[PDB]
Amino acid sequence: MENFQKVEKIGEGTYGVVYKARNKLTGEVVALKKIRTEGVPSTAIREISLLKELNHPNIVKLLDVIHTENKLYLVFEFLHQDLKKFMDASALTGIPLPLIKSYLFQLLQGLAFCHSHRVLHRDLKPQNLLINTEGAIKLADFGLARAFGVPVRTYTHEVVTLWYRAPEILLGCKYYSTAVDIWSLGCIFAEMVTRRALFPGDSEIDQLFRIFRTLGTPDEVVWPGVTSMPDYKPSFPKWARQDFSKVVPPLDEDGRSLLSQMLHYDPNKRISAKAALAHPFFQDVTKPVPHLRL
Numbered sequence: 001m002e003n004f005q006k007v008e009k010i011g012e013g014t015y016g017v018v019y020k021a022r023n024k025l026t027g028e029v030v031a032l033k034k035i036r037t038e039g040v041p042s043t044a045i046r047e048i049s050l051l052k053e054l055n056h057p058n059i060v061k062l063l064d065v066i067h068t069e070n071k072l073y074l075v076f077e078f079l080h081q082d083l084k085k086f087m088d089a090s091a092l093t094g095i096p097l098p099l100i101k102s103y104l105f106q107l108l109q110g111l112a113f114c115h116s117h118r119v120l121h122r123d124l125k126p127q128n129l130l131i132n133t134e135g136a137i138k139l140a141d142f143g144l145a146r147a148f149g150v151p152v153r154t155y156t157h158e159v160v161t162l163w164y165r166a167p168e169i170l171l172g173c174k175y176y177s178t179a180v181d182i183w184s185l186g187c188i189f190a191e192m193v194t195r196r197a198l199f200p201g202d203s204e205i206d207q208l209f210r211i212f213r214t215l216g217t218p219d220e221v222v223w224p225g226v227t228s229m230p231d232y233k234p235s236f237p238k239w240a241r242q243d244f245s246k247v248v249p250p251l252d253e254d255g256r257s258l259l260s261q262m263l264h265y266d267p268n269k270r271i272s273a274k275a276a277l278a279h280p281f282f283q284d285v286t287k288p289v290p291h292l293r294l
């Protein structure tokens with residue numbers, strides 16, 4: 001690196017390889033993502049650059065956008081662990097409710113900020129939620145999906161996770177709204193509670209049908225306009241809705257109520273991040289210290 005010294009390979013993101021690196025001058029430790037293919041669109045450059053101004057305590061700071069040697073690198077603030085790893089580490093005992101609540105509350109504040117600035121994530125997942133020893137959790141990769149357009153894959157033929165995708169995306173809607181992020185966060189909230197993914201689909205249709213089997217096959221009553229969606233088929237099986245008491249036991253009624261509002265089929269009926277912050281579920285929210293082993 002011209003100014004960095006790769007510490008280690010953090011992993012293989014959806015856009016490219018990511019390294020933990022140290023700025024040789026400032027000495028700061030950061031996450032360096034090499035972006036994937038042969039030109040680097042200027043449209044993307046301007047858009048990404050805009051994200052450098054999107055600063056909030058629950059949003060991973062984009063420190064720099066480096067377009068040199070016709071290559072694109074994104075420099076982000078570094079956090080030591082992601083929520084997917086934390087959940088696996090907490091699988092035996094489960095993340096305590098107070099911490100689940102603190103994290104959900106912080107993530108909603110982050111979404112409320114991004115959404116008020118007209119920035120969507122579009123691909124939220126546990127691996128994109130980073131945590132530190134102080135009890136903070138931050139959203140990573142906000143705005144990259146729109147700026148870089150179609151995702152497709154990573155760069156090493158890795159399989160795209162569909163588990164957190166909103167039904168309107170699965171049904172072929174071409175215009176995303178802030179609601180897609182609320183849906184993904186609801187799926188993550190449920191996973192923290194039960195310690196099992198809510199809708200672990202292994203294909204686009206399996207993803208959609210897992211959603212239908214749990215929440216009921218949507219119709220014009222609960223989702224006006226659904227039968228006119230691009231990929232909707234009248235031949236979809238019609239499953240009856242299950243009770244939330246069976247979907248996220250043993251979450252209390254405040255929790256089930258909030259989750260039900262984050263998983264409404266109609267994106268327009270889905271609760272906003274701002275409104276969710278006011279839900280009675282957060283009446284007793286606090287900020288616990290997580291047991292993090294680094």
Ligand SMILES: NC(=O)c1cc([N+](=O)[O-])c(NCCCO)cc1NCc1cccnc1
Nearest residue numbers: 010011013018031076077078079080081082
């Ligand atoms: N900004 C960051 O700090 C960061 C960035 C990305 N990324 O993709 O830009 C990332 N990839 C998620 C892959 C998980 O291995 C993980 C990060 N930190 C959490 C972490 C740090 C060290 C080891 N395991 C997890």
